[PDB]
């Protein structure tokens, strides 16, 4: 699969585009470090060195965004000293990285730098706790397209650092056949045929609602099949008749302990939307030694 | 105060860009609705009628954002039907708005329009929860500069819709002097003083760690003073000694009930970042008929 390399490229091209904007909203439309009024109260060479410390256990994510924010503002002039990486388990009070550079800048860059990290890390921390219960199982967590507008790619990254796998990037890289769709084409068969013909190289998923609808999907050549409302028993039986090509995705947006039962049934994937549609930002701060 | 104007005028510009942002991440690069591949398997004319609905009581917010997704995908080819207005009581299973238009479109714009509403309405709903504990006092709830990257204004707007007040929108429209600044200036008096010399018109707020610095800055003429770390009693006596020009702000992301006791003291503003750094999307679905 290349989606990993497809994601990895897209975020690189997207990080500056977003960081640019985050700083723009803070500095009144323009990205000029001098626009910070309150910072003007310091002599333009007063050197400084702060430290960012997490105040709760979690998982780190957001390194690339940080480096970018200061780069935009005063590249080469602010040195960074990381203690952790984009996927590490962080402990309460553990200091995450230190900053070196002109006072004015650190103060301006503070908010935006922390805002990116609190978010991405908040999400990455949530994902892991979610993936923690699928241990000793051969089932995998997954994301959706229910993300905060703008942070699409970045959230898929944090989901990644959290320990989950990603789903289609959007409407472009994958087919998600549904009831409406199956009706328009006449059959599942005819549906996945016109699909595999529209754009040959993309994967096709057909949404099934019952065990029988699922057979017609298997034989159809659909590489992934999501089940909408099957109970522990039907899921278990479903898997049993699939095997090869058996790419089952359960939309298990539901409860914590239910997660365990689903995974238990050997179903390939469990997509959770709550992972990227809500954010409990990690508690962080920048102290000045 | 013109902040409302400055705000509503910024969003007026920010919305088309933000709708265009999410409409690109999902359509792999460009706002070309034809990019949705699964949509191609559908009859290019079959109109439909979709109804959005929330599964929970809260507050609405997002109309101009929704109105912009669909215009942007099919200028005047889709018709919306509004029941609630931005900042209105929403009721479990209440119909929010309807959609009349081509199904190929309604399907694509679905996810993007809904993410906006889920987020904004999610935030707005919880601000109402907060302002609702302030009935009786003269205390104004404020936001901070702790917002998810990109949605600075959208969240500042959603905050109004909930009942809260807007604190500055960036580093460029007011002074917020913390210990760090106070250090280089020499003292507190000297810092406020110096601030007034540079930018004569933009409001000046200084953060004070104790009573000596309180009246020390009060006499210097600042307009709002942030009381950092005051316990109940000290806050109460501070309210006292200020009286005139008593724009006393107390950043209190402390807790649901200790929040009341604070405002009780008769302090002016309580800025809670907890409102825009965390997102608990509102549960809505857009069902077909
Ligand atoms: O479109 C998707 O990728 C998707 C796939 C799995 C579950 N839901 C979604 C969604 O965004 O609603
Ligand atoms: O103006 C601010 O930046 C602000 C306003 C009051 C409280 N907090 C903040 C903050 O972002 O830390």
- In sequence order, what DSSP letters do the residues of B145-177 get, joined into one string? S---TT-HHHHHHHHHHHT-B---SSTTSSEEE
DSSP B75-89: TTS-EEEESS-SS-E
The dihedral through the CA atoms of B35, B40, B43, B49 has a sign that is: negative
DSSP β-bridge partners for residue A175:
A204
**For ligand 1, atom 1: residue with the closest CA:** A145
**Within 10 Å of residue B179's Cβ, how many Cβ atoms?**
15
B111 as an active site residue: the answer is yes
- Whose tokens are 């969003």? That residue is B11
Q: How many angstroms separate the most distant Cα atoms in chain A?
A: 74
**Which among B42, B103, B198 has the least Cβ separation from residue A40?**
B198
A206 burial type by CB count under 10 A (0-12 exposed, 13-18 middle, 19+ buried): buried
SS3 B102: strand
Closest to B174 measured CA to CA, from B114, B229, B230, B226: B226
Catalytic site residue from B4, B111, B277, B280: B111
A58 touches A121 (CB < 8 A): yes
CA distance A195 to B40: 9
CA distance A158 to A150: 14
- Taken as a whole, chain A contains a residue count of 289
SS3 B200: coil
CA distance A129 to A254: 15
Task: Indicate the top mutation candidate among A140, A142, A145, A202 to test ligand 1's pocket, ranked by most ligand atoms within 8 A of CB.
Answer: A145
**For ligand 1, atom 5: residue with the closest CA:** A144
A281 touches A129 (CB < 8 A): no
**Range list of H helices, chain B:** 3-25, 37-40, 63-73, 103-131, 152-162, 179-185, 188-198, 211-218, 232-242, 256-264
SS3 A253: coil
B185 touches A40 (CB < 8 A): no
Contact between B171 and A281 using a beta-carbon 8 Å cutoff: no
DSSP β-bridge partners for residue B117:
none
CA distance B170 to A35: 10
CATH 3.90.1170.20 positions along chain A are 15-125+279-289
The gap between the terminal CA atoms of chain A, to the nearest Å, is 46
DSSP β-bridge partners for residue B97:
B52, B82
Catalytic site residue from A178, A236, A247, A260: A178
Residues 6+ apart with CB under 8 A from A212: none
B45 as an active site residue: the answer is no
DSSP β-bridge partners for residue B95:
B53
Q: Which of 2.60.40.1180, 1.10.3720.10, 3.30.750.24, 3.20.20.70 would CATH assign to domain A126-278? A: 3.20.20.70
Method: X-ray
Compute the nearest-CA separation of A115 from chain B (Å): 6
DSSP A24-55: HHHTTTS--GGG-TGGGGS-TT-EE--EEEES
B156 as an active site residue: the answer is no
> Which residues from chain A sit within 8 angstroms of residue B188, using beta carbons?
none
SS3 B182: helix
For residue A81, CA distances in Å to A90, A95, A283 come to: 16, 11, 20
DSSP A54-99: ESS-EE---HHHHHHHHHHHHTTSSEEEES--TTPEEPTT-EEEEE
> Which residues from chain B sit within 8 angstroms of residue A34, using beta carbons?
none
A27 touches B170 (CB < 8 A): yes
A247 touches A218 (CB < 8 A): no
Catalytic site residue from A110, A205, A207, A249: A207
Compute the nearest-CA separation of A97 from chain B (Å): 19
> Which residues from chain B sit within 8 angstroms of residue A56, using beta carbons?
none
SS3 A206: strand
DSSP code for B139: P
A149 burial type by CB count under 10 A (0-12 exposed, 13-18 middle, 19+ buried): buried
Name the closest residue on chain A to residue B193, using Cα atoms: A41
Q: Binding-site residues of B for substrate, please? A: 111, 144-146, 168, 178, 207, 228, 251-253, 272-274
- Mutating which of B38, B49, B201 best tests the A interface, going by the most A Cβ atoms within 10 A? B38
Rounded to the nearest angstrom, the distance between the alpha carbon of A169 and the centre of ligand 1 is 10
The fold of B15-125+279-289 is Aldehyde Oxidoreductase; domain 3 (3.90.1170)
DSSP β-bridge partners for residue B224:
B205, B247
A21 touches B150 (CB < 8 A): yes
> Which residues from chain B sit within 8 angstroms of residue A20, using beta carbons?
none
B276 lines ligand 2 (CB under 6 A): no
CA distance A224 to A247: 4
Structure tokens at A243: 């095997």
What backbone phi and psi angles, to 5 degrees, belong to B219?
A: -65, -25
Q: CA dihedral in degrees (B214, B217, B223, B227; nearest 10)?
A: -30
For residue A55, CA distances in Å to A117, A119, A271, B278 come to: 13, 14, 30, 16
CA distance B252 to B130: 12
For residue A117, CA distances in Å to A12, A20, A272, A289 come to: 16, 15, 22, 20
CA distance A229 to A206: 14
CA distance B271 to B145: 10
Compute the nearest-CA separation of A136 from chain B (Å): 31
- Whose tokens are 């020009």? That residue is B245
- Whose tokens are 């604070």? That residue is B262
Catalytic site residue from A3, A64, A146, A247: A146
- Whose tokens are 């993410």? That residue is B115
> Which residues from chain B sit within 8 angstroms of residue A118, using beta carbons?
146, 277
DSSP β-bridge partners for residue B270:
B141
For residue A207, CA distances in Å to A28, A201, A216, A229, B264 come to: 46, 19, 11, 11, 55
CA distance A183 to A71: 53
B168 lines ligand 2 (CB under 6 A): yes
A181 lines ligand 2 (CB under 6 A): no
- Mutating which of A41, A65, A190, A278 best tests the B interface, going by the most B Cβ atoms within 10 A? A41
> Which residues from chain A sit within 8 angstroms of residue B148, using beta carbons?
115, 119, 148, 151, 279
Question: Is A192 annotated to bind ligand?
Answer: no
Name the closest residue on chain A to residue B281, using Cα atoms: A278
A145 touches B111 (CB < 8 A): yes
**Which among B37, B145, B194 has the least Cβ separation from residue A171?**
B37
Residues 6+ apart with CB under 8 A from B156: B7, B143, B147, B166, B169
A143 touches A253 (CB < 8 A): no
Structure tokens at B123: 């935030």
CATH 3.20.20.70 positions along chain B are 126-278
Closest to A227 measured CA to CA, from A189, A200, A254: A254
Q: How would you label A22-44 residue by residue, b for 16+ Cβ within 10 Å and e otherwise? A: bbbbbbbeeeebebbbbbbbbee
CA distance B105 to A29: 32
DSSP code for A241: T
CA distance A70 to A98: 13
* Ligand nearest the Cα atom of residue B174: 2
Closest to A281 measured CA to CA, from A73, A113, A120, A47: A120
Closest to A87 measured CA to CA, from A62, A119, A54: A62
Residues 6+ apart with CB under 8 A from B112: A149, B19, B22, B23, B26, B69
**Within 10 Å of residue A106's Cβ, how many Cβ atoms?**
24
SS3 B257: helix
What backbone phi and psi angles, to 5 degrees, belong to B146?
A: -115, 70
Residues 6+ apart with CB under 8 A from A101: A47, A48, A49, A70, A74, A77, A78, A79
Compute the nearest-CA separation of A90 from chain B (Å): 20
Give the pocket of ligand 1 (CB within 6 Å). A 144-146, 167-168, 176, 251, 271; B 111
Closest to A68 measured CA to CA, from A6, A28, A120: A120
**Range list of H helices, chain A:** 3-26, 63-74, 103-131, 152-162, 179-185, 188-198, 211-219, 232-240, 256-264, 274-277
- Whose tokens are 């056949």? That residue is A177
SS3 A281: coil
- Whose tokens are 């101009």? That residue is B64
Name the closest residue on chain B to residue A153, using Cα atoms: B25
Closest to A131 measured CA to CA, from A119, A142, A116, A118: A142
């Amino acid at each position: 699969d290349d989606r990993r390399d497809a994601l990895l490229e897209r975020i690189n091209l997207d990080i500056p585009a977003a960081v640019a904007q985050a700083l723009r909203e803070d500095l009144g439309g323009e990205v000029d470090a001098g626009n910070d009024i309150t910072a003007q109260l310091l002599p333009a060479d007063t050197q400084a060195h702060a430290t960012v410390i997490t105040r709760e256990d979690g998982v780190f994510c957001g390194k690339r965004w940080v480096e970018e924010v200061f780069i935009q503002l005063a590249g080469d002039d602010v040195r960074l000293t990381w203690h952790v990486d984009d996927g590490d388990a962080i402990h309460a009070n553990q200091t995450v990285f230190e900053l070196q550079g002109p006072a004015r800048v650190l103060l301006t860059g503070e908010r935006t730098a922390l805002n990116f990290v609190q978010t991405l890390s908040g999400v990455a921390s949530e994902v892991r706790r979610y993936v923690g219960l699928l241990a000793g199982t051969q089932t995998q967590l997954l994301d959706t397209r229910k993300t905060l507008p703008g942070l699409r790619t970045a959230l898929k990254y944090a989901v990644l650092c959290g320990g989950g796998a990603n789903h289609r990037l959007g409407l472009t890289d994958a087919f998600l056949i549904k009831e409406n769709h199956i009706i328009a084409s006449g059959s599942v068969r005819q549906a996945v045929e016109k699909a595999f013909w529209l754009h040959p190289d993309v994967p096709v998923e057909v949404e099934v609602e019952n065990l029988d609808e699922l057979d017609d999907a298997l034989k159809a050549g659909a590489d992934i099949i999501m089940l909408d409302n099957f109970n522990t028993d039907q899921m278990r039986e479903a898997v049993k008749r699939v095997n090869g090509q058996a790419r089952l995705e359960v939309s298990g947006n539901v409860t914590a302990e239910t997660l365990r039962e689903f995974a238990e049934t050997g179903v390939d994937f469990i997509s959770v939307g709550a992972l990227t549609k809500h954010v409990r930002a990690l508690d962080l701060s920048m102290r000045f030694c």
